[PDB]
UniProtKB/Swiss-Prot annotation, chain B:
Cofactor(s) annotated in UniProt: pyridoxal 5'-phosphate
Family per similarity comment: Belongs to the TrpB family.
Pathway: Amino-acid biosynthesis; L-tryptophan biosynthesis; L-tryptophan from chorismate: step 5/5
GO-annotated molecular function: tryptophan synthase activity
Alphabetical keyword list: Amino-acid biosynthesis, Aromatic amino acid biosynthesis, Lyase, Pyridoxal phosphate, Tryptophan biosynthesis
GO CC annotations on file: cytoplasm
Name of protein: Tryptophan synthase beta chain 1
Known role: The beta subunit is responsible for the synthesis of L-tryptophan from indole and L-serine.
EC number: 4.2.1.20
Native source organism of the sequence: Pyrococcus furiosus (strain ATCC 43587 / DSM 3638 / JCM 8422 / Vc1)
Catalysed reaction, written as an equation: (1S,2R)-1-C-(indol-3-yl)glycerol 3-phosphate + L-serine = D-glyceraldehyde 3-phosphate + L-tryptophan + H2O
Tagged with keyword Nucleus: no
HAMAP family attached to this UniProt entry: Trp_synth_beta
Length: 384, 382
């Protein structure tokens, strides 16, 4: 439940029953032979795992320092690592006898991954999304409908993510007998931060075997962007006990940390309670979740998962920030130099790895988690 | 250069030398160990090959006849099978010592694939595109520029694909010493129909191994959409000598064959010279305008190797309308959680019809040539 002092289950009493049932089901199935056979079957034949580990030779030669490798999550079905968790949890729900998935979504990217997994597995899908966010992300709303999901605009309160979370929780209280609440990052009350990390750990397990095959040794550094923290935990987790492997999470610097238009919760936030967890949040003087900004839609989440708060505390991972401008430069540079258009989220990680590689020697190795592809971001990059 | 009575090399004398040199280099590199090592290395690490073969269980059960498997070219880097050929030819060009790639593009899809492959290999990329198509395809043009390519609008003639083709040819005449002309389908003068087929044949080779692993037998039918015909040849070719495997090509029926607004060249075209080859093209003597809701099926011709397979009746060619393709687009999205390319949706639509008339122990593989992210704006605007 706890990662040092971070995590917990800060929920109304009514949710203790569904969370207990979910934890018991997860304990039973997580190492079950049949459950894992079906999960591996869907990951392989539907999602296209394993994803390759790509040596960005041109980008490496240009910078003239460490070798940069890219873990190609951009190639998973849907174009984002989110799929790995959507499948795992949707299948877990099916094994629990659930017939319905619900989820909240801010950018709509988790909404899409949940819709896709629900369609795959023949489940009903209802997605809660703040009305202001429905307005900003019309193509993701269309995608979800195309995939058979029902998008429910949340018109109450602030009409944003926090209002969608509350409606999702309220729904789940009433419908948990047949409905699974599918959380999209390493956030939420226990057991979700653990479950999501476990379903993303395939990223790091593949990358470890791939880098040993390619180079005969572990990486010197692994760099991943951090929203809620799921792609970063997924690639980090299998290396945590490899003491010499440096781990770097990259948060959204937005328009600058001084500008207050960012989403760097670890760097600039404070300890607080939200979404049923004790972790770091960007929140105002009155304890309310405060406005966040990134050019990358998926880095708008106002907090960060408790396992990252813990990793920062014990100094096992370092956490840095990259601005909108630096992420944009990296988005262009990767496209031109390697013919890979990255997600703006992932471009934050590419940006930082480019700075880091320059200092390091040529025999050293950086793996960047390329968490998604940038087709989704073409509109806004063209606008800006 | 010939596939029965189709194919050939209908070019001016100025292009004979470049084509001979390409043929000679291709013979030298196609079975060369190092060339193939590097090709497979890029296909694996950069493009993500092999693509999976997916059993569409829910779609199968819903229709209640044959098993429907999908060869998932939608998961290749870029979202379309075009990447396989773009990497192949770009690497060939590099092994020949070329520093520059040119190509023509209609919807921008081959232009994007060429631009990606050129970026990968450190080559200069110029893309000829008709000015009418440039105006209609804002996002693909942007993709191409974002990938480091230069888009050269063509304002000659009717400002369409045929004018782009003619401009690209004119360029290659001048620049061939250092420029490779990268043709995007199984079309053009020899040796291009052969080369592109050979670079797409990886699709069928994987699919053969994958279906034997899953079902212990070859499929009863293979279904693929046909524009110029590269994704179809890629999946067909390794099964051509497996006599019991039925091969079906699906052309764009558009608004309907009787409406005349379509791109069904095999079905309704006549035999003639166009783009340096003898094959079927849609005509009025002149090139006729074509239509499909799928941008990639708007090519007025078809590869000579399909003309040939049709004539000897090794493959059957059919058509599917815009409306049928759209129904299948929606159906695959809802039922399997895969948003297909509108091109690929033609194959899916036909496979769903055919599946209903077959037994539950029979097997269909559909080539899912690409993903549908690129078509969302079209489908919403509809
Ligand atoms: Na955050
Ligand atoms: Na045609």
């Amino acid at each position: 439940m706890w990662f040092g002092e971070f995590g917990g289950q800060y929920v109304p009493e009514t949710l203790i029953e569904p969370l207990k049932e979910l934890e018991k089901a997860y304990k039973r199935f997580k190492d079950d032979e049949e459950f894992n056979r079906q999960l591996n079957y869907y990951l392989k034949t539907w999602a296209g795992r394993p994803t390759p580990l790509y040596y960005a030779k041109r980008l490496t030669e240009k910078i003239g320092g460490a070798k940069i490798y890219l873990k190609r999550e951009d190639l998973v079905h849907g174009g984002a690592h989110k799929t790995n968790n959507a499948i795992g949890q949707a299948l877990l729900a099916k094994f629990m006898g659930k017939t319905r998935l619900i989820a909240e979504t801010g950018a709509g990217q988790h909404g899409v991954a949940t819709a896709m997994a629900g369609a795959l597995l023949g489940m009903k899908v209802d997605i809660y999304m703040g009305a202001e966010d429905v307005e900003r992300q019309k193509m993701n709303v269309f995608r979800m409908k195309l995939l058979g999901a029902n998008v429910i605009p949340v018109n109450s309160g602030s009409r944003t993510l926090k209002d969608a979370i509350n409606e999702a929780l309220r729904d789940w209280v009433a419908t948990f007998e047949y409905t699974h609440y599918l959380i999209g990052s390493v956030v939420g009350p226990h057991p979700y931060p653990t479950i999501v990390r476990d379903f993303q750990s395939v990223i790091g397990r593949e990358a470890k075997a791939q880098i040993l095959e390619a180079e005969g040794q572990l990486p010197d550094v692994i760099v991943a962007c951090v929203g809620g923290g799921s792609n970063a935990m997924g690639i980090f987790y299998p290396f945590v006990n490899d003491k010499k492997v440096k781990l770097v999470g990259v948060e959204a610097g937005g328009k600058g940390l001084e500008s207050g238009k960012h989403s760097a919760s670890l760097n600039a936030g404070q300890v607080g309670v939200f979404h049923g967890m004790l972790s770091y949040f960007l929140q105002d003087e009155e304890g309310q979740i405060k406005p966040t900004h990134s050019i990358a839609p998926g880095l708008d989440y106002p907090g960060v998962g408790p396992e990252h708060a813990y990793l920062k505390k014990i100094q096992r991972a370092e956490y840095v920030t990259v601005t909108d401008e630096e992420a944009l430069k990296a988005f262009h540079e990767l496209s031109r130099t390697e013919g890979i258009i990255p997600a703006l989220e992932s471009a934050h990680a590419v940006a930082y790895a480019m700075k880091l590689a320059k200092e390091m020697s040529r025999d050293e190795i950086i793996i960047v988690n390329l968490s998604g592809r940038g087709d989704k971001d073409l509109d806004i990059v063209l606008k800006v």
